[PDB]
Amino acid sequence: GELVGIITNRDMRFEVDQSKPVSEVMTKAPLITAKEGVSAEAALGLLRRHKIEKLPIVDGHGKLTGLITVKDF
Amino acid sequence: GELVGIITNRDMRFEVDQSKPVSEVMTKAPLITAKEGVSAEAALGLLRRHKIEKLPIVDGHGKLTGLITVKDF
Numbered sequence: 001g002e003l004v005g006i007i008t009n010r011d012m013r014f015e016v017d018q019s020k021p022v023s024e025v026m027t028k029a030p031l032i033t034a035k036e037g038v039s040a041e042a043a044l045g046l047l048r049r050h051k052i053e054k055l056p057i058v059d060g061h062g063k064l065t066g067l068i069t070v071k072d073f
Numbered sequence: 074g075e076l077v078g079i080i081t082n083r084d085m086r087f088e089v090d091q092s093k094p095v096s097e098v099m100t101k102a103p104l105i106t107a108k109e110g111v112s113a114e115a116a117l118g119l120l121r122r123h124k125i126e127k128l129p130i131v132d133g134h135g136k137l138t139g140l141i142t143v144k145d146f
C-alpha cells in the first residue's frame with residue numbers, strides 16, 4: 001500500500017515492448033507531493049515551480065489519498 | 074551570440090502577463106545538448122534518458138548550430 005512512484009506517458013512514449021512491467025519504467029520515489037486539503041493555488045504553484053503536470057496528495061503517513069493533474073486547471 | 078537557455082511552452086503555460094521578457098521565464102544554461110552530426114538514435118536516447126523533448130545541437134565552441142525535437146521522431 002505504499003506510493004512507490006508515478007508512471008506517465010512521457011515515461012512510456014517510446015517503449016516498444018508493451019509487456020514490460022511498470023516497475024522498470026516508472027519514476028521512483030521520492031516524488032513532489034502535497035498534503036491533504038491543499039488549495040488549488042498552492043497546487044498550481046507547485047506544478048509551476050517543479051515544472052511537472054502531476055501532484056500526488058498524501059496523508060500524514062505518506063499514504064496516497066489523491067492526485068491533481070494540470071487537466072483540472 | 075551565446076546559447077543562454079531554452080524557452081518552451083511548459084515554461085510559459087500559466088504566465089498571465091504576456092509582456093514579460095524571455096529572460097525571466099527561460100530555463101537558463103547549462104542545458105542538455107548534443108554535438109554536430111549526432112545520429113537519430115543518439116538524440117532519441119538522450120531525450121529518453123533526460124526525459125525532455127528538445128535537444129540543442131552545438132559545435133566544438135559551444136555555439137548553437139541546430140535543434141532536435143520529439144516532433145521529428
Ligand SMILES: Nc1ncnc2c1ncn2[C@@H]1O[C@H](COP(=O)(O)OP(=O)(O)OP(=O)(O)O)[C@@H](O)[C@H]1O
Pocket residue numbers: 006007008009010011026027030031032033051052053054055056124
Ligand atoms: N509529482 C511528480 N514528482 C516527480 N516526478 C514527476 C511527477 N509527476 C511527473 N513526474 C515525472 O516527470 C516527467 C514528466 O512529467 P509530466 O507528468 O509533466 O509529463 P507528461 O504528462 O507525461 O508529458 P507530455 O504531456 O509532454 O507527454 C516524467 O518522467 C514523470 O514521471
Ligand SMILES: Nc1ncnc2c1ncn2[C@@H]1O[C@H](COP(=O)(O)OP(=O)(O)OP(=O)(O)O)[C@@H](O)[C@H]1O
Pocket residue numbers: 051079080081082083084099100103104105106124125126127128129
Ligand atoms: N535540452 C533541455 N535541457 C534542459 N532543460 C530542457 C531542455 N529542453 C527542455 N527543457 C526544459 O524542460 C521542461 C520541459 O521540457 P519539454 O520541452 O519536454 O516540455 P514541453 O514540450 O513544453 O512540454 P508539454 O508538451 O508537456 O507542454 C521545460 O522547463 C523546458 O524549459
Ligand SMILES: [Mg+2]
Pocket residue numbers: 053
Ligand atoms: Mg503536457
Ligand SMILES: [Mg+2]
Pocket residue numbers: 126
Ligand atoms: Mg509533450
